Structure formats: structure tokens, C-alpha cells
Amino acid sequence: PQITLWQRPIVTIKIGGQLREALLDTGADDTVLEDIDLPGRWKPKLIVGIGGFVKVRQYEQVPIEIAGHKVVGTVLIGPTPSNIIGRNLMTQLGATLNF
Amino acid sequence: PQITLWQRPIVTIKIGGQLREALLDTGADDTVLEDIDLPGRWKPKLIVGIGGFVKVRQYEQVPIEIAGHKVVGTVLIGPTPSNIIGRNLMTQLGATLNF
Numbered sequence: 001p002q003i004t005l006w007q008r009p010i011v012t013i014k015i016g017g018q019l020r021e022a023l024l025d026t027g028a029d030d031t032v033l034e035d036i037d038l039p040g041r042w043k044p045k046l047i048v049g050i051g052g053f054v055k056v057r058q059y060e061q062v063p064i065e066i067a068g069h070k071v072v073g074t075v076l077i078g079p080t081p082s083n084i085i086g087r088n089l090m091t092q093l094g095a096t097l098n099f
Numbered sequence: 100p101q102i103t104l105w106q107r108p109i110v111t112i113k114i115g116g117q118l119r120e121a122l123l124d125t126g127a128d129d130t131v132l133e134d135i136d137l138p139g140r141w142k143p144k145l146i147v148g149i150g151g152f153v154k155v156r157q158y159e160q161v162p163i164e165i166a167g168h169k170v171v172g173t174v175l176i177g178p179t180p181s182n183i184i185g186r187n188l189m190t191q192l193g194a195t196l197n198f
């Protein structure tokens with residue numbers, strides 16, 4: 001679809017059998033979720049944003065469905081004010097910004 | 100223009116006679132710059148992101164040119180790892196996200 005930006009660009013996601021919403025964030029390199037626990041091994045990772053740095057868990061080769069589209073990629077689990085879908089997965093959707 | 104998201108979506112801006120680059124951030128409500136000082140009155144404002152909260156200065160009715168397009172809107176000045184253009188100004192450009 002094509003969406004304008006008068007409201008926050010929020011989509012539905014499915015991961016590990018659970019449903020959540022997430023913000024499509026062109027300003028995010030990576031995808032970060034807070035309200036999901038994933039199984040198996042992970043590695044510590046550090047991320048930064050407006051208010052400083054967060055330690056998160058990095059999960060690799062995670063199945064995730066974003067607005068209907070099934071992809072597999074890296075998902076970070078940790079504190080964030082909002083679940084966010086970053087460019088790592090938006091590239092898999094063929095997303096573009098148009099102005 | 101139409102841009103893909105394999106790299107960070109960075110554009111050139113002109114504000115208060117100075118040139119800078121900034122990230123087009125669909126995950127940002129507001130526009131936040133770090134490397135510019137603006138004149139006149141301002142109000143304190145609190146913003147949040149990954150990591151936490153930041154106090155910034157809110158400047159209203161600021162002329163800013165974004166990738167060639169002249170707009171006037173609110174600009175926040177404060178700490179950020181990157182200058183960012185948020186939806187307040189991206190809506191003035193008629194920006195859309197497409198997939």
C-alpha cells in the first residue's frame with residue numbers, strides 16, 4: 001500500500017505465534033520489539049537513539065510477518081517506547097519513500 | 100524523488116543560512132537538529148526515543164529548506180545522534196511510504 005504520514009505509520013506484525021503492532025521507521029537501521037519474548041540463543045547488542053543507548057538481545061533468522069508479508073531476518077528484543085520495523089526488514093518489502 | 104532504503108535516507112537541508120544533512124525519519128513525530136543554533140525565543144520541550152528522554156528547545160515558525168522544498172514549521176534543537184526530519188515537516192512535502 002501507499003500511506004501518508006499525518007498519523008504514525010503503524011502496521012500489524014506476527015512473530016512467534018503472537019500478534020503485535022509496530023512502527024515503520026525509516027530512521028531505524030534495525031527492527032526492535034519490546035513486548036515479545038523469543039526462544040533460543042541470542043547475542044548482546046548495543047543500540048542508540050535519541051535518549052542514549054540500550055542493551056538489547058539480538059535474535060537471528062527470526063520468522064516475522066509484516067503487514068501480510070513473511071520475511072526472515074534479525075530481530076532485536078529490548079526496551080523501546082514503541083515496537084519498530086527498521087530498514088533491515090523494510091528493504092525486504094521493497095519499501096520506498098516518495099516526496 | 101523515490102528512494103529505496105538500502106542506505107539511510109539522508110537529505111540536504113538549509114536553515115538560518117546554514118547547510119546541513121538530516122535523516123528522513125517516518126518514526127519521528129517532530130524534527131530535531133543538533134548542529135545548529137537558532138535565534139529568538141524558544142520553549143523547553145521533552146522528547147523521548149530509544150534510550151530515554153532528552154530536553155530540547157522548541158523553535159516555532161522556522162524557515163527550513165528540505166531537499167529543495169521551502170517549508171516553515173517547528174524545529175527542535177538539542178542532543179541527537181543524528182539530525183532528523185520528522186513527520187511534522189515530511190507531511191508538508193507530501194511524503195509517502197510505499198510497499
Ligand SMILES: CCCC[C@@H](CN[C@@H](CCCC)C(=O)N[C@@H](CCC(N)=O)C(=O)N[C@@H](CCCNC(N)=[NH2+])C(N)=O)NC(=O)[C@@H](NC(=O)[C@@H](NC(C)=O)[C@@H](C)O)[C@@H](C)CC
Binds near residue numbers: 025
Ligand atoms: C519509539 C521511538 C520511535 C522511533 C524513534 C526512532 N528514531 C531514530 C533516530 C535516529 C537518529 C538518532 C532511532 O532511534 N533510530 C535507531 C533505532 C534503533 C536501531 N538499532 O535501529 C537507530 O538506527 N540506531 C542505530 C544507529 C543510528 C546511528 N546514528 C548516528 N550515529 N547518527 C543503531 N544501530 O543503533 N523516534 C524517535 O526516537 C522520536 N520520538 C518520537 O517520535 C516521540 N515523540 C516525542 C514527541 O518525543 C514518540 C516516540 O513518542 C524522535 C525523533 C522525536 C520526534
